[PDB]
């Protein structure tokens, strides 16, 4: 391993319907370096800033429950199993 | 916490090395140490 | 044998090993002692834990104590001038190094316990720096012994 | 410095033997019992907190500084950029 | 939810979407890892129900690429130790395969003890054997986190300090015998000399010669225990430990300057070889490679029987630069020493014009 | 002699190591380690004896200890 | 042999090699140790990476310890006055230059860890200045060595 | 021919003061300018490899003292003349205290130079030019230390 690994800068063409499923499968593989195409824009107007709010309040309520169980001292088993990524058709059902 | 268990193997082998090398002083310090500090290895679990 | 005034230099090493190490152990106790009282008014839980710089400053004092007895056990009338100069150089090299080590313990021991009143993570960092300031008094010991044995 | 640190480590190992364990060892009759049990216990925390901790940490960073300065200056330039791959390994359990 | 937040965070990182109703992403990826991403992306779009497979176009731009190193569970500690000083550029030689051995070795020479070598590796094997249940617990103070992050570094540190602890005894500053102590030739010194009158009184700590009957064989593995029981112990050791410290210092730095060749012959830059590799390896062999062969020459030539007036390597290293030759205090180490040493300095002297003046012809 | 014994024994590890290595992903790392560990531990052992071989000194031994060392060696 | 008072200057070389060097290491530990406690209130994550000027200043005492041992090994009664003066200048050139080096690691180690918390880019530059700060004690070593061989 | 027994004291004090005072000057040159690095770099992290020139110009001052401390330590012998020992003493003060002056000058203008470079980089081509004239003060003391140890 004395020389290096060599990088490519390939270019992706992801469709609108295949925009969540491919990137989620790329994350399980874990060998990509997504580069910012538009750095000169603010924190909103990034096309997907609507539900990344909604994922934070889903995280905010889940941080509240995790405080609640340990306050009542019911230590939860891990049972180590990495689950698969939930589709956005399951995202509406998750808030309910 | 269990540092007494670390004290066993060092003081056991130190008593052996004084058993080898008048010589009767070296055996007197040896028989006094690992018979007693090895006996003082009674500690908590 | 040596001259009559030969014993003056060796007893100076017996005193300066204890005097200058006491000044270091005092400054390690006094300068860090003000840091305990300023910390204590907000955090009364870290009081028995906060005494660790004033204990290590006490170790600086017994570094000068062991060489002061070891020089005084080697004292004798009619000693050579060569033997007395070693014990003078041994006494200065542990007291003035203990005064330096007691200076370092007093400074970081004060600022460490003032800092750990606002963050408990600093307590493992402060005790690391106090160890490095402690060996300065210890390094003065091993040159004091290697001069006093010969 | 790898002669200075080794000489300081050798001389410290000598003095922390010949001063604080020799007092327990050079005793005629009641040496191996009540005396050396607490003498070794003082020797136990001294060889850990002084001889193991700081000498082990000083030699760790000064074996390190010979690589950063005297080894990685002949060939290594090192401006660099790190990869940071997009993965889910950050979220292992928490 | 923390996965789904991450995918929607990197889709914010994704395309301006002005081009079409699709997403474009300029990602970096390993060239040899390119079959696995395409096999995943072909079935990744199948879950969405799309009949259109996403494609992967390769670019040929001139933006600087990041570095990547194949990282194991073992070599991760030695990687980020090198990476802490500076990130490596594209296709520089990583010193981390050489840092795996040399950095615990350079630790072990300056921290050398058999007894502390036992203490370091027995703590280390406790950190790696129980490492499943230790990692199960969340997080602790900095005196457990950095120590657990380097559990394999401190493993090789404890192993090598056991070995270098055998090169110079020093097991809690004590020593061991393995078919040795064959310096301490008591009988020959006193039998062949005078025994009892001398035992007490005039001498309390008298020296041994090496040429009466005393020294047979130099202790086949390490430092013989006759030095540790003597009183002149340091004047042999500081003579030994200073010479070997600068011996290891040259060949480690010579190993570093030889790796500058492989960083220039791979870039196809033969200009850099003819002022970067050639005069630098001559400059270090003439001044400093000549120093380590003087340590080897003095060690084998002189002995106790002859040559009490032995020269010193400090003065003869000075007379290379300060050109004054001819003196009666320090004799020459070998025949023709005046002729070879003036030649070694001028070829070290003219390398500084050779390095400087011939490179700016671009 | 100890020099000719250890040279071929350090000439076995690190020569025949590059020859008897698994074909796994760590092959390059394993060979490097044999090469290095070989060149470090041998030359460390080399300069310890050589700085003993043909000496100039003798151990300055204290009084009691010299007769005591005659009795044991 | 030499005069009776000859050994005084050599043991002064053995003590000044340790006194001034430990004092230099004391200031490098104290001044940079105050910088750690002011840093860690805002940034607790870098205290393992930040105790490097405390360690680099600790070698100053170890640099003085080597010459203190080397001078004490050459000590015998009836040394020449030429040999005694060489060890005196050996101790002063490694002690007081170590005191100079401990001043440099003390100041740069203080202000450098203040800027390291507010910006992690300084860590490559901070340890680079500490290289040139430590070699002052290292240059004092090799002149103390070359004076002690004679 | 053979000098007095006290003769080697003065030349030894020339060897020590050539190294003590030059390292003390290189202490102020590194410490005062190293403060200016950490104060500048909180707002301009890009200039941190360009701004380490005032700390390496102070490093040359230490090597100015290191050379003549070697030069004096090789002219030393048992029973040197009292004329020769005063030469090595006067050589050592003329490089140590001059390097102390050059090191004190480098530390002041090196600190002030990197403060104003954080506000305008046009000072950087002028900061080195003043740093040159501060560094030759050590070189002026070096070349007179060599001509005193030559005799
Ligand atoms: C801080 C201390 C640092 C020490 C720094 C000291 C710096 C001072 C330098 C002194 C210079 C004297 C050198 C000299 O001339 O030697 C002369 C004497 O030689 C001696 O006897 C030396 C005695 C010096 C005493 C210093 C100890 C002070 C420690 C106190 C501390 C206690 C503190 C406790 C609280 C020899 O010259 P002479 O004329 O040829 O003599 C012949 C006469 N005769 C035949 C009778 C011998």
From Swiss-Prot, chain B:
Where are its TM segments located? 1-18, 23-43
Family under the similarity heading = Belongs to the RNase K family.
Protein name, per record = Ribonuclease kappa
Top-rank taxon, per record: Eukaryota
- Where is it localised? Endomembrane system; Cytoplasmic vesicle, Clathrin-coated vesicle membrane
Oligomer and partners: Interacts with the proton translocation complex V0 of the V-ATPase. Interacts with ATP6AP1.
Q: Where would one find the signal peptide in this protein?
A: none
Q: Which residues of the full protein are shown?
A: 16 to 87 of 98
From Swiss-Prot, chains C, G:
Keyword Transport on entry? yes
Keyword Signal part of the UniProt annotation: no
Give GO MF terms, alphabetically: proton-transporting ATPase activity, rotational mechanism
User: Which CDD domains does the entry link to?
Assistant: ATP-synt_Vo_c_ATP6C_rpt1 (cd18175), ATP-synt_Vo_c_ATP6C_rpt2 (cd18176)
- Where does it live in the cell? Cytoplasmic vesicle, Clathrin-coated vesicle membrane; Cytoplasmic vesicle, Secretory vesicle, Synaptic vesicle membrane
One GO BP: pH reduction
Q: How does it sit in the membrane?
A: Multi-pass membrane protein
Q: Which GO terms describe its cellular component?
A: clathrin-coated vesicle membrane; membrane; synaptic vesicle membrane; vacuolar proton-transporting V-type ATPase, V0 domain
Q: Which residues lie on this side of the membrane: Lumenal?
A: 72-87, 148-150
Q: Describe its assembly.
A: V-ATPase is a heteromultimeric enzyme made up of two complexes: the ATP-hydrolytic V1 complex and the proton translocation V0 complex. The V1 complex consists of three catalytic AB heterodimers that form a heterohexamer, three peripheral stalks each consisting of EG heterodimers, one central rotor including subunits D and F, and the regulatory subunits C and H. The proton translocation complex V0 consists of the proton transport subunit a, a ring of proteolipid subunits c9c'', rotary subunit d, subunits e and f, and the accessory subunits ATP6AP1/Ac45 and ATP6AP2/PRR.
What name is this protein filed under?
V-type proton ATPase 16 kDa proteolipid subunit c
Q: Which gene encodes it?
A: ATP6V0C
UniProtKB/Swiss-Prot annotation, chain F:
Q: What is the first-listed, main subcellular location in coarse terms?
A: membrane
PANTHER family noted in UniProt: V-TYPE PROTON ATPASE SUBUNIT E 2, VACUOLAR ATP SYNTHASE SUBUNIT H
Entry's transmembrane regions: 1-21, 29-49
Name of the protein described by the UniProt record: V-type proton ATPase subunit e 2
Q: How does it assemble?
A: V-ATPase is a heteromultimeric enzyme made up of two complexes: the ATP-hydrolytic V1 complex and the proton translocation V0 complex. The V1 complex consists of three catalytic AB heterodimers that form a heterohexamer, three peripheral stalks each consisting of EG heterodimers, one central rotor including subunits D and F, and the regulatory subunits C and H. The proton translocation complex V0 consists of the proton transport subunit a, a ring of proteolipid subunits c9c'', rotary subunit d, subunits e and f, and the accessory subunits ATP6AP1/Ac45 and ATP6AP2/PRR.
Residues in the Cytoplasmic compartment per record: 22-28
State which ranges are Lumenal (membrane side): 50-73
Q: Which InterPro entries match?
A: ATPase_V0-cplx_e1/e2_su (IPR008389), ATPase_V0-cplx_e1/e2_su_met (IPR017385)
Tissue and organ expression note:
Expressed in brain (at protein level).
* Membrane topology of this protein: Multi-pass membrane protein
The highest taxon in the source lineage is Eukaryota
Question: Sorted alphabetically, which Pfam families does this protein's record hold?
Answer: ATP_synt_H
Q: Where in the cell is it found?
A: Membrane; Cytoplasmic vesicle, Clathrin-coated vesicle membrane; Cytoplasmic vesicle, Secretory vesicle, Synaptic vesicle membrane
Q: Which family does it belong to?
A: Belongs to the V-ATPase e1/e2 subunit family.
Q: Which residues does the annotation flag as glycosylated?
A: 63
Q: Tell me, which GO biological process terms does this entry list?
A: pH reduction; proton transmembrane transport; transmembrane transport
* CC annotations in GO: clathrin-coated vesicle membrane; synaptic vesicle membrane; vacuolar proton-transporting V-type ATPase, V0 domain
From Swiss-Prot, chain H:
InterPro entries according to UniProt: ATPase_proteolipid_c-like_dom, ATPase_proteolipid_csu, ATPase_proteolipid_su_C_euk, F/V-ATP_Csub_sf
Q: How does it assemble?
A: V-ATPase is a heteromultimeric enzyme made up of two complexes: the ATP-hydrolytic V1 complex and the proton translocation V0 complex. The V1 complex consists of three catalytic AB heterodimers that form a heterohexamer, three peripheral stalks each consisting of EG heterodimers, one central rotor including subunits D and F, and the regulatory subunits C and H. The proton translocation complex V0 consists of the proton transport subunit a, a ring of proteolipid subunits c9c'', rotary subunit d, subunits e and f, and the accessory subunits ATP6AP1/Ac45 and ATP6AP2/PRR.
Tissue expression = Expressed in brain (at protein level).
Which GO biological process categories is it annotated with? pH reduction; proton transmembrane transport
- Family per similarity comment: Belongs to the V-ATPase proteolipid subunit family.
The answer to whether the entry has keyword Membrane is yes
Q: Name one GO molecular function term.
A: proton-transporting ATPase activity, rotational mechanism
Protein's cellular compartments: Cytoplasmic vesicle, Clathrin-coated vesicle membrane; Cytoplasmic vesicle, Secretory vesicle, Synaptic vesicle membrane
The name of this protein is V-type proton ATPase 16 kDa proteolipid subunit c
Q: Give the record's keywords alphabetically.
A: Cytoplasmic vesicle, Hydrogen ion transport, Ion transport, Membrane, Synapse, Transmembrane, Transmembrane helix, Transport, Ubl conjugation
Q: How does it sit in the membrane?
A: Multi-pass membrane protein
Segments on the Cytoplasmic face: 30-51, 111-127
Q: Which domain of life is it from?
A: Eukaryota
State the species of origin: Bos taurus (Bovine)
